[PDB]
C-alpha cells in the first residue's frame, strides 16, 4: 500500500556529507565548452555538474599541490539540464545553470571564393 508525501525531496541528512560541504558550496551546471585546440564535438554532448574551486597550496616537503577540499575532483554527468538541477536540489547544493551553447548554423559555399564582384573572392588557395 502506497502513501502520500507531498514535501520536496531533501536527502541532505541521510547522505552523510559534512554540513560545511552542503551549504557553503556552489555547484555549476553546464555543458563543457569545446576544447578549441580540436574540432571534435564529442565532449559537448552531456551536462556536467562541478563545484567551486578552493585553495591549493604547496606541500613544504616536495612542493606538491595540497588541498583540503574533498569535492575538488567531483564531476557528475547528466543527460539533461533538468536531471542535473533535480540532483542538485535534493542534495541541498545551491547551483548556477549555464544554458547550452550550440554553434550557429553557417552558410558555406565553395563558389563564393571566386566571386565576380564580391569581397569573398580569395586571393590564394
Amino acid at each position: 500500500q502506497l502513501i502520500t508525501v507531498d514535501e520536496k525531496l531533501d536527502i541532505t541528512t541521510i547522505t552523510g556529507v559534512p554540513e560545511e560541504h552542503i551549504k557553503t558550496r556552489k555547484a555549476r551546471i553546464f555543458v563543457p565548452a569545446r576544447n578549441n585546440m580540436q574540432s571534435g564535438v564529442n565532449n559537448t554532448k552531456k551536462w556536467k555538474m562541478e563545484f567551486d574551486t578552493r585553495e591549493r597550496w604547496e606541500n613544504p616537503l616536495m612542493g606538491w599541490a595540497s588541498t583540503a577540499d574533498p569535492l575538488s575532483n567531483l564531476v557528475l554527468t547528466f543527460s539533461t539540464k533538468e536531471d542535473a538541477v533535480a540532483f542538485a536540489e535534493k542534495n541541498g547544493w545551491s547551483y548556477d545553470v549555464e544554458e547550452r551553447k550550440v554553434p550557429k548554423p553557417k552558410s558555406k559555399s565553395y563558389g563564393a571564393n571566386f566571386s565576380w564582384n564580391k569581397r569573398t573572392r580569395v586571393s590564394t588557395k
Binding site: L2, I3, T4, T13, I14, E55
Partner: protein, 114 residues
C-alpha cells in the same frame, strides 16, 4: 506523490519510532560510559545524544525519518555489542579539532573559505 513507505505511514507514526530510539539511546549512555571506560559523564553523553537528535528536528518526510531511525538503531547496536571501540564512541566529541570561529572576520583572516 504516491510512494512506497519504509515503516511509517506518516509523520505521526515516524515520531513514535523516533521517541522509541531516543529512549533506547538515553538508557544506554550509562552503560556505554561504564563499559568503554570513558572519561566523560553520563550528562555529557546524554547531551551529545540530544544534540544528535536535534540536528534532524526539521525533517518532515516520514521516509527520511525512517531511514534516520534505521541508522540510529544500527549505531546503537554497534555500541551495545562493543563492535565499536572507544575511538569510535569518542568520535562524536571531536576532541582534537581546533576551534573554527564562525564569524566573517575570523574566516577572512585565515583564508578564502566562506
Amino acid at each position: 506523490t504516491s510512494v512506497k513507505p519504509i515503516f511509517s505511514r506518516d509523520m505521526n507514526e515516524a515520531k513514535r519510532r523516533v521517541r522509541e530510539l531516543y529512549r533506547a539511546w538515553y538508557r544506554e549512555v550509562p552503560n556505554t560510559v561504564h563499559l568503554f571506560q570513558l572519561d566523560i559523564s553520563v550528562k555529557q553523553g546524554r547531551d551529545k545524544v540530544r544534540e544528535m537528535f536535534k540536528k534532524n528536528a526539521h525533517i518532515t518526510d516520514p521516509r527520511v525519518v525512517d531511514l534516520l531511525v534505521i541508522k540510529g538503531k544500527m549505531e546503537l547496536e554497534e555500541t551495545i555489542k562493543v563492535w565499536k571501540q572507544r575511538t569510535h564512541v569518542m568520535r562524536f566529541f571531536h576532541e582534537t579539532e581546533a576551534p573554527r570561529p564562525k564569524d566573517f572576520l575570523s574566516k577572512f583572516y585565515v583564508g578564502h573559505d566562506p
